[PDB]
Amino acid sequence: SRKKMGLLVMAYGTPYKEEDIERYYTHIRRGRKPEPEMLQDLKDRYEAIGGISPLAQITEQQAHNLEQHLNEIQDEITFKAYIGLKHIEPFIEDAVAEMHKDGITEAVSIVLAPHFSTFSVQSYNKRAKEEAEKLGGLTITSVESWYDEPKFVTYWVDRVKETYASMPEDERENAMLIVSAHSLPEKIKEFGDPYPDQLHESAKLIAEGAGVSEYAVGWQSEGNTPDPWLGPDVQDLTRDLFEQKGYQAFVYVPVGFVADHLEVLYDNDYECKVVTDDIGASYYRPEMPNAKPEFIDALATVVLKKLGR
């Protein structure tokens, strides 16, 4: 009696093994193969954060935990998860084609990134739709942004509360909360991209929920292009913030990301850690959503909200 639907979970993509690093970054760098040194540096970082295999993994766990959860919290629809990545196979078009081939005709998609941006989300969505329109006999309703879904906000708030709870009294009274997301070229402002505002909004929601009156919005992981990127970068923000007020502890909430990937384990847990360690402040960075039940239910609700269920 159930209606079959495709669950197109989209993401970035992540190397599966060390030997993928090259083509992965080459894809990311639009056909520009990293120099031998970059390559060696990149392998080192991945080794430094615990290896690669666990990364691509999380996304797979996120898709399937959601597929099963959605299939048990309601009995009108039976979902079948499909992973569409951006920089590695299975690519978005690939997933779409598979669904079509499997006979899917009605699908709903979601990107594993809370905030909407013309650069990423709109693109993954427009690509998924043009693939379906190309094959025909397949429609897709795409979720644009879910950074504001209450259960998702609740997740970050609860983690932050525990982190502040864990602090000594003197740190609890002199800490700084740094909410962040992947940086993006400033040019997106040309199109009125809500990305920056959604981040600030995520930051206002979380701080307000955890009862934090001292916090700042920042960006990280910016790429390499002549044109300027969204800032200030978390490294400079921390140092500058310490410079003017002298916070004894910093809390990083990379709300933009949903798991333990490079951008967090290294760019946060190492780069920001280097700076807090230099200024003598304490480093804190709450557990990422990953495939945890609480997170899956939030995503599940977002999908059901998108369907009017």
Ligand SMILES: [Zn+2]
């Ligand atoms: Zn990046």
